[PDB]
Amino acid sequence: TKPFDEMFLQDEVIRPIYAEYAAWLQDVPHQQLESKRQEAELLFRRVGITFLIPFDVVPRILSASEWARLSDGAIQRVKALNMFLHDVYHDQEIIKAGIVPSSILANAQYRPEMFGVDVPGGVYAHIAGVDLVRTGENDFYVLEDNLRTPSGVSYMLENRKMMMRLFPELFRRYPVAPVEHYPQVLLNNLRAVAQAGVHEPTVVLLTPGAYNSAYFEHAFIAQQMGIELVEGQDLFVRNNAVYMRTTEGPKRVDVIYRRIDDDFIDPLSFRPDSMLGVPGLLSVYRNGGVTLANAVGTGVADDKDTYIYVPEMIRFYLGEEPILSNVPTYQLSKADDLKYVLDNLAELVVKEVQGMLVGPAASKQELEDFRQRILANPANYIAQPTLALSTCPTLVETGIAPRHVDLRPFVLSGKTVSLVPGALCRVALREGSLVVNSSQGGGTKDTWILK
């Protein structure tokens, strides 16, 4: 019993989807792609790379039918999440029906400033990141939802550009769907959420600035879109409108793609010490003078305590059964969950909200150590059963060996809900590791969606 591999079947048989890649790999002149060392030599000789997050040249390939199911599943989930957000800030029908407890209103991410506020098209999460894992041929799990300021598209776009630059001949052998139109699809969706009356909306990207880890992505996506990259001080509010400062005079801003947290957008309504925001911005948004994307108060839908109700949102709002499954998740802030987790620690995966323990890959000492770490602050942890995480062929020291991967596509909601046929794929390079996170042996791959 081994974890499902994307390339190699039950025996050493190659899955039909990877046959053409295996053929190309055999024709590769000399020992150029036989192991991690030869891959690192190829990447340096051609593109001058020295391992910045590591990159693996073996793509994560998905068929047109796998993506169609995955894509239907992600759109269904995001529609229910947006309908949930409209509901919590309006009639709260799901709470009155007893499906979601009223304790959700104790969540710090629930913004009473958004109660009764109508947002253009009822869209709260204009961009939604969905973290997915595979366990079988037709088995996918949603690990987490990302509805605040989702990131990673720059790695998705650059990884494709890198693969096309290194191996153009490989793109001739596979019918790979393109991804580079993402910024223009996003810009078109932002224009569509302009307030009622606005004919040719002005769109800007509000950034915290250079001293932010994702700043390059902010500058990159704004440049790819062809819109102004602004900081708080570049904008100002007056008479229910937001203006951008220009030498020729103030230019009205209709839509702001915010890459700043709610807490920092308006010192007159939230954190008063913030220098990232725009004073009075929340009032203009609440009174229909501007659109913020993503909306203020989306955090209540992707919080660890709300995650468990997502399958029930799909049934309640859409009258459908969930296409994608949630992962059973324990919230160590709950006494029943804390009791269970500490009693079955060697069988579970424990993660901090805002460190990670792999119970089956831990000794009695490190298990007892983590037990103390948990009890020092239990509310900062969640736990899930250890899943049979799918492996993708990855170039390692010994050669081409299976390594654990995860997938992040980006759902876009404007007047329509859609996905560009691509995703950020993260790989856990170290043997036996399930840490796809770049902090401890984590890298990226290009994700190919076949036409």
Binding site for Cl ion (CB under 5 A): 149, 151, 214, 259, 311, 416-417
| DSSP single-letter state for residue 177 | P
Count the neighbouring beta carbons within 10 Å of the beta carbon of residue 280. 18
Cα torsion 256, 260, 261, 265: sign: negative
CB of 148 to Cl ion, least distance (A): 8
Nearer to Cl ion, 232 or 393 (CB): 232
CB of 311 to Cl ion, least distance (A): 4
Nearer to Cl ion, 149 or 394 (CB): 149
Q: Put the strands of the sheet holding 251-253 in their side by side order.
A: 235-237, 242-244, 251-253
CB of 322 to Cl ion, least distance (A): 6
CB of 212 to Cl ion, least distance (A): 7
> Could you tell me the CA-to-CA distances from 230 to 35, 83, 206, 207, 292 in Å, in that order?
44, 30, 5, 6, 14
State the Cα–Cα distance between residues 10 and 5, nearest whole angstrom. 9
- Which residues have C-beta within 8 Å of that of residue 324, sequence separation ≥ 6? 70, 73, 74, 76, 77, 130, 132, 140, 141, 142
- Which residues have C-beta within 8 Å of that of residue 447, sequence separation ≥ 6? 59, 60, 62, 156, 159, 407, 422, 423, 424, 425
Nearer to Cl ion, 217 or 303 (CB): 217
DSSP class per residue in 251-317 = EEE-EEEE-S-GGGS-TTTS-TT-SSS-TTHHHHHHTTS-EEESPTTTHHHHSTTTGGGHHHHIIII
- Which residues have C-beta within 8 Å of that of residue 276, sequence separation ≥ 6? 208, 209, 231, 232, 260, 264, 265
- Tokens standing for residue 389: 């995480």
Q: In DSSP terms, which residues pair with 330 in a beta bridge?
A: 383
Nearer to Cl ion, 76 or 394 (CB): 76
Query: Which residues does a chain break follow in the chain (C to N more than 2.5 Å)?
Result: 51, 354
CB of 149 to Cl ion, least distance (A): 4
CB of 69 to Cl ion, least distance (A): 17
SS3 percent helix, strand, coil of the chain, rounded to 5, is 35, 20, 40
CB of 152 to Cl ion, least distance (A): 10
Nearer to Cl ion, 82 or 394 (CB): 82
Nearer to Cl ion, 150 or 280 (CB): 150
CB of 312 to Cl ion, least distance (A): 7
Nearer to Cl ion, 71 or 159 (CB): 71
Nearer to Cl ion, 102 or 416 (CB): 416
- Tokens standing for residue 297: 């108060």
CB of 97 to Cl ion, least distance (A): 16
Give φ, ψ of 140 to 5 degrees. Answer: -130, 140
Q: Which residues of 436-451 are buried (b: 16+ CB within 10 A; e: fewer)?
A: beeeebbbbbbbbbbe
CB of 326 to Cl ion, least distance (A): 7
Nearer to Cl ion, 71 or 202 (CB): 71
CB of 363 to Cl ion, least distance (A): 35
Nearer to Cl ion, 149 or 306 (CB): 149
Nearer to Cl ion, 151 or 189 (CB): 151
Are 129 and 150 in contact by the 8 Å Cβ rule? The answer is yes
